[PDB]
Every structure is written in C-alpha cells, then in structure tokens.
Amino acid sequence: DFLSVGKLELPGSMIGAVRDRAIDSGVLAKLSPEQPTIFGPVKGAVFSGV
Amino acid sequence: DFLSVGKLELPGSMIGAVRDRAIDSGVLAKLSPEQPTIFGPVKGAVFSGV
Predict the structure, then answer these.
(1) Are β-strands A13-19 and B42-47 bridged in parallel, bridged antiparallel, or unpaired?
(2) What superkingdom heads the lineage (chains A, B) (predicted)?
(3) Nearest residue on chain B to A6, judged by CA atoms?
(4) What's the rounded Cα separation, in Å, for the pair A33 and A39?
C-alpha cells in the first residue's frame, strides 16, 4: 500500500476541438455558374436540336 | 625438437567491438512530430458530420 497518482486526480491536458472530416460543401457550383436573380419564380425559353 | 611459438602464448589483437546490423529506431518519429505535454490523461473533443 502507498500513495498513488489517482488520488490527486489531476485533470490532465486538452488537445482542443477539431472536425472529424473536412466539410464537403458540394459541387454544382464548379460545373454551372450561379445566376443570382431577384425574388420570384424564374422562367425562360429552351430550344434543343436541329 | 626445437623452441616453438608453442609453450609460449601470444595474446594477439582485438579489432574492437562492433554490432551486427544497425539498430531500428521507431518510425513514428518520422511520420509524425512529437507533442510533449504535462503528465496526466490526454482528452480531445471532435465534432462530426454536417
């Protein structure tokens, strides 16, 4: 029997907070550029083929 | 019959001590830098997912 370290219960040390994985914002912004418009339903014309 | 190197005893020569194959120090010293901390437990919090 003796005096141990567990009886002093030193808190220890904290590394800190860090993300598990790098956040994936998502594509669809690299393929097609954004087209910011005023609020309201948008509509246009589509013409395909010859 | 004659006087030989026998009946006498020569010590010889020592070519010094050496070791077979170089020692293998741990790899973790290369792959990752050491982070010295004060004695005690080491905690860490990670926030996961979006």
Answers:
(1) parallel
(2) Viruses
(3) B40
(4) 18
